[PDB]
Design a binder for this molecule. Sequence first.
Ligand SMILES: Cc1cc2nc3c(=O)[nH]c(=O)nc-3n(C[C@H](O)[C@H](O)[C@H](O)COP(=O)(O)OP(=O)(O)OC[C@H]3O[C@@H](n4cnc5c(N)ncnc54)[C@H](O)[C@@H]3O)c2cc1C
Ligand SMILES: Cc1cc2nc3c(=O)[nH]c(=O)nc-3n(C[C@H](O)[C@H](O)[C@H](O)COP(=O)(O)OP(=O)(O)OC[C@H]3O[C@@H](n4cnc5c(N)ncnc54)[C@H](O)[C@@H]3O)c2cc1C
Lengths: 460, 460
Amino acid sequence: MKTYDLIVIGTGPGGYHAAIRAAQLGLKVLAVEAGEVGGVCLNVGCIPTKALLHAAETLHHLKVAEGFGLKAKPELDLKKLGGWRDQVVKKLTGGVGTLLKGNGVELLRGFARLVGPKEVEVGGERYGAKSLILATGSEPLELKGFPFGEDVWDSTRALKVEEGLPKRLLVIGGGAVGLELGQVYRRLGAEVTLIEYMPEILPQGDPETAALLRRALEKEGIRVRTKTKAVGYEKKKDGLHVRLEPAEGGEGEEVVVDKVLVAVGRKPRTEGLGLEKAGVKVDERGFIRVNARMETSVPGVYAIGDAARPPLLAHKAMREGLIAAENAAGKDSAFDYQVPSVVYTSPEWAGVGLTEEEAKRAGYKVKVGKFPLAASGRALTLGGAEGMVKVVGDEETDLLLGVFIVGPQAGELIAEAALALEMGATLTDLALTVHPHPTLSESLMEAAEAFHKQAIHILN
Amino acid sequence: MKTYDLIVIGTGPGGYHAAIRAAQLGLKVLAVEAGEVGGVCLNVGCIPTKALLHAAETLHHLKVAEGFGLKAKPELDLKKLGGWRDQVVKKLTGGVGTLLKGNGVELLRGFARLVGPKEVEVGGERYGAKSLILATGSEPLELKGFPFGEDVWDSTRALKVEEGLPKRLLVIGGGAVGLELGQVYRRLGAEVTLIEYMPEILPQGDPETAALLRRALEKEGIRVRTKTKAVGYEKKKDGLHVRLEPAEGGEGEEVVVDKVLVAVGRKPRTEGLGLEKAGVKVDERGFIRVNARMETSVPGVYAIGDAARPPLLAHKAMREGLIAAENAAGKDSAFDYQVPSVVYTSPEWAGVGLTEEEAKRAGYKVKVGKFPLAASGRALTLGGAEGMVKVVGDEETDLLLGVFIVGPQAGELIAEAALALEMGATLTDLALTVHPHPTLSESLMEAAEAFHKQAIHILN
Ligand SMILES: Cc1cc2nc3c(=O)[nH]c(=O)nc-3n(C[C@H](O)[C@H](O)[C@H](O)COP(=O)(O)OP(=O)(O)OC[C@H]3O[C@@H](n4cnc5c(N)ncnc54)[C@H](O)[C@@H]3O)c2cc1C
Ligand SMILES: Cc1cc2nc3c(=O)[nH]c(=O)nc-3n(C[C@H](O)[C@H](O)[C@H](O)COP(=O)(O)OP(=O)(O)OC[C@H]3O[C@@H](n4cnc5c(N)ncnc54)[C@H](O)[C@@H]3O)c2cc1C
């Protein structure tokens, strides 16, 4: 049995961050990976999806561009697009491999399973360490009545646009994955229908900005059906006849499509991992129970990322990996941070902090400030202003509580909001910062001014 | 004589901000404008230039897009482009006019001249007020040997691309104006040579990131010559023969172009304004002398924006207008803010805070963190991925001192840095904020980690 200071199972965002940070702190690390280095985000998630979205937005904007004299007869080669997507993925996963090697981390390819609290079995061989970090991630959640197959795709299959685009696609799930892939397919020419069980898409996010995103997608032809669920389907020669019903059940309604993309969630990869042999507690949902130090019920064993707890986001997994690594190295670290969320559709949607309802539930005297991109000079110079910024704060203390953005570059602008929350910023602090003009970032400053009823570019 | 609580001369960014904020505070305001409402930024500066840059970037990106299957046969109608530029300007200036009216601000069209400390003459009529706010802005600075005319353009003329593109253009000035218009013309097909008197472009900005921008421009075919000046020219049959020399004087070198764009600076519009009749002191350069409250040598008379002092930026003028208005309303406000600066070229350049040299002179123990966009996953998904983020801080206290960025969306990312500085953030604070992945904003977080020698995506 080979021994190390730390064994990390999984090399996705969380796992490779843990391995590298642990190595920087002087630990001898072994990283085990059953598939491609880089995990879901780099191979079949964040990266390939953002790549497709960029190509789709570039194509889409050309229609807007006709407005300023740019006439074009764009021809998109899907095979070439798929090739570029693959190249981007390869460059990034290769880069992580080079990073692991350069940091002295040993990389073992195989499926790891615990056989004890501090012993892992891989390919019949045993490996041990005083610390273990479980970063096994998640997988597409299956939906009753829609088993994955040739006609029912998961997000991974949906990425392969070069394998034939369906004329009609039904997307089940109004979360980031469904919205993003849905828009990609629409912009590539497919008829797209998206259904969401909740009253509004992005159910956990601010309903107002989420609604604006839905409206933008509807304007592009995507049929969005909220408070709706898909019960099952029947395969016929003319396509898949899917039965739709109201959220709480009711009168049936049929929709016929060629393919179905199921994006209703993720399932943590914690079964068949040997956790029951190590004493690691798992909750009813399959998530490994952890505290703020990312430590499990077993001393010296940590869990991070999608396998540990929602939200299922990459930057969160990355930070959790650093925390677990630092603690495995003997430090005293803990996760207590504001986690932003972004949807990379066009316009983008981003949020961080508390929604109006959550702030109210928390006991704050909620007050909001809004700034429409229709009043943004920068948005106009970019060919059109679609979106808004909403700031949530306490009117008594002036404390900033949350920020929600819908529009171009929302994902880049939300970092300013995250920093503001981490610094305990007030709405006055946000308004007092001199944002450059003209920029989309200015909308945050103006939304803060609107909160105080003194915005300049809009009547208060 | 008609009397008001406040008279604002000029309706550019500074002027209309002062007029509106004063109105919000209950003052009876009169705003005087000799030309188009909205000033330089909205009519012949920020807005039209950013619009042209966006069109040029959309066209340019098609080359990179070919890399992912996007085939196109672009055709740019310059007349249509100019028409769009005009539409954007008209919508925004019309918007400011609507805001002034909506706020109860009286708008008088004409050229105002003070005739006394608190009295202004317009069109032969007299107007008075307890407070006066001077926001007359600036105009293109003329260069010895290059009087403006048919062959020597100022930025306003350069905006009119629909009036014929020159085969060869010489741009004098390596500031934001020269760089931006130079890139617009190059992307539109012109041969472009740009010269800068100082050793590096963007002389007051971080030289490291400024040099990367220069190199990016040179890669696009723009010939950039620093430490160089233009002495004069002679109009011949084959074009304009311009004599160049080392900035400090020396052997001459001739360059032949069809048109020259002079972008060497601005001159404050303070002559013929009646300041000598009111007792308002002006410095050697023509700027109205003001303190942090934006107060001039005459109680009750304030000056803001380009007419008051450099840097000559829109967001600065806007904030100064708010300060002046608030003080005119009886409050106690003062300008003590970090002012970011942005160049909207591709890649963009942005900076805020202290450069390494300025921090060193300030007495800080300078330490820096750098992160290359070549290591950014998001940058790769957007195609080209060139640029870098540099953070400047104090080693002993960990205090963030300055941030400089060169790359896509640099101007949108700098607001986070500005907020950080206003909040007294340390490099640790910046690194601890969980930035969304994958985003370009992550580069700031990673540059902070690099400062501490523990960045994950690059070897330290
Ligand atoms: C289509 C799509 C788009 C997304 N877009 C975004 C986005 O834009 N932004 C964002 O923040 N998040 C996004 N996500 C979610 C993001 O991908 C995840 O939050 C992130 O990958 C979680 O990292 P992780 O390290 O926990 O796990 P994972 O990346 O899943 O990696 C776990 C790794 O462990 C390996 N592994 C598992 N079990 C074993 C075992 N027993 N032995 C050895 N190796 C094992 C796996 O093969 C894998 O490589 C997206 C997800 C999808 C599906
Ligand atoms: C090509 C170009 C691009 C630029 N790009 C940017 C950029 O991207 N970002 C940025 O921050 N800055 C940019 N600037 C600079 C920015 O435009 C100025 O900083 C800003 O306009 C200054 O605002 P202001 O209110 O002080 O003055 P101005 O906007 O100049 O407005 C002054 C107003 O006063 C009027 N006026 C003057 N004298 C009188 C009088 N006696 N009576 C009545 N009315 C009078 C003028 O007609 C005018 O409308 C750019 C400038 C140029 C030339």
